[PDB]
Design a protein that fits this description.
monomer, 18 residues, synthetic protein, alpha-helical bundle, monomeric
Length: 18
């Protein structure tokens, strides 16, 4: 659903900073 896809994208962006 949209919420899951939003979370996946946001967490991916946060992970890229590690």
């Amino acid at each position: 659903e949209q919420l899951l896809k939003a979370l996946e994208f946001l967490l991916k962006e946060l992970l890229e900073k590690l």
